[PDB]
């Protein structure tokens, strides 16, 4: 489930 | 005891984090007797210059009239990056070259520093949406970009986090992150991986804040209690810690390819994420391992 978190944290980038 | 100097004023233009500069000059004993020269601290200091500067050599003997080249070396390391980033210090200084039983020669150091996202706090980075030298982010875009690259290209990278990258590429990566939000980070996987480590190590405040450090160690053996210490961190620190733990667990899945095992991760990342201002080393790795497994 790393890809979900990473995608979210990439918001605004 | 007399010296002749090729020059006395030196300029260090566009100084960058971890990028070496050298300004060289020649000293020549123009006196009639042999002299001893050495750089000395200015009235009431410990050192003869600031940390980011060094003289090579800083002392010597000169017969009349042999010459010697002096290298004035500027290198902004993790010790100075934050104060120079902040403007609390400037690329300026005075070096006092001292003739044993004689004159003092004053060398003036000037120039300018270019701030880096490296050595900048997680909190300030999460508040800046554009590159430093072009609601807050959950994590700094720069750490996201590094992890993003590794996640995309390096999951199956042999010896990830065990092979050093290329110095040239490291600098390219840092400059890249200082000035852009790129589609691809330049450089090999090993370079990007090492840039990440350098980023964490350069943080003015570690991922796990200093004051929580000791509580982490004490709590090291109770997983419910470790997690709660983590809850005490500021939002951006908590997020970066969780983010990284999740990333490292992701890499552990590909261990058969990238050689990334729990041992290596523990010993490598513990000291980076959990710095103090022995066998505490053991409770530390234990603390981290608790999260990886």
UniProtKB/Swiss-Prot annotation, chain A:
The F&H motif, an approximately 12-13 amino-acid sequence centered around Phe and His residues, is essential for binding to OCRL and INPP5B. Plays a role in endocytic trafficking. Required for receptor recycling from endosomes, both to the trans-Golgi network and the plasma membrane. A motif (F&H) lies at residues 1-13. It comes from the Eukaryota. Was named after 'sesquipedalian', an unnecessarily long description of a simple thing. The gene is PHETA1. Belongs to the sesquipedalian family. It comes from Homo sapiens. The chain holds residues 223 to 235 of 249 of the full protein. Forms homodimers and heterodimers with PHETA2. Interacts with OCRL and INPP5B. Interaction with OCRL may be important for endosomal morphology and function. Disulfide bonds: none annotated. This is Sesquipedalian-1. It is found in: Early endosome; Recycling endosome; Golgi apparatus, trans-Golgi network; Cytoplasmic vesicle, Clathrin-coated vesicle.
From Swiss-Prot, chain B:
Catalyzes the hydrolysis of the 5-position phosphate of phosphatidylinositol 4,5-bisphosphate (PtdIns(4,5)P2) and phosphatidylinositol-3,4,5-bisphosphate (PtdIns(3,4,5)P3), with the greatest catalytic activity towards PtdIns(4,5)P2. Able also to hydrolyze the 5-phosphate of inositol 1,4,5-trisphosphate and of inositol 1,3,4,5-tetrakisphosphate. Regulates traffic in the endosomal pathway by regulating the specific pool of phosphatidylinositol 4,5-bisphosphate that is associated with endosomes. Involved in primary cilia assembly. Interacts with APPL1, PHETA1 and PHETA2; APPL1-binding and PHETA1-binding are mutually exclusive. Interacts with clathrin heavy chain. Interacts with several Rab GTPases (in their GTP-bound forms), at least RAB1B, RAB5A, RAB6A, RAB8A, RAB31 and RAB35; these interactions may play a dual role in targeting OCRL to the specific membranes and stimulating the phosphatase activity. Interaction with RAB8A modulates OCRL recruitment to cilia. Interacts with INPP5F. This is Inositol polyphosphate 5-phosphatase OCRL. It is linked to Lowe oculocerebrorenal syndrome: X-linked multisystem disorder affecting eyes, nervous system, and kidney. It is characterized by hydrophthalmia, cataract, intellectual disability, vitamin D-resistant rickets, aminoaciduria, and reduced ammonia production by the kidney. Ocular abnormalities include cataract, glaucoma, microphthalmos, and decreased visual acuity. Developmental delay, hypotonia, behavior abnormalities, and areflexia are also present. Renal tubular involvement is characterized by impaired reabsorption of bicarbonate, amino acids, and phosphate. Dent disease 2: An X-linked renal disease belonging to the 'Dent disease complex', a group of disorders characterized by proximal renal tubular defect, hypercalciuria, nephrocalcinosis, and renal insufficiency. The spectrum of phenotypic features is remarkably similar in the various disorders, except for differences in the severity of bone deformities and renal impairment. It comes from the Eukaryota. Residues 2-116 are annotated as: ASH. Brain, skeletal muscle, heart, kidney, lung, placenta and fibroblasts. Expressed in the retina and the retinal pigment epithelium. The record marks 162 as: Arginine finger. Transmembrane segments: none annotated. It is found in: Cytoplasmic vesicle, Phagosome membrane; Early endosome membrane; Membrane, Clathrin-coated pit; Cell projection, Cilium, Photoreceptor outer segment. It comes from Homo sapiens. Residues 135-293 form the Rho-GAP domain. Belongs to the inositol 1,4,5-trisphosphate 5-phosphatase type II family. The chain holds residues 563 to 896 of 901 of the full protein.
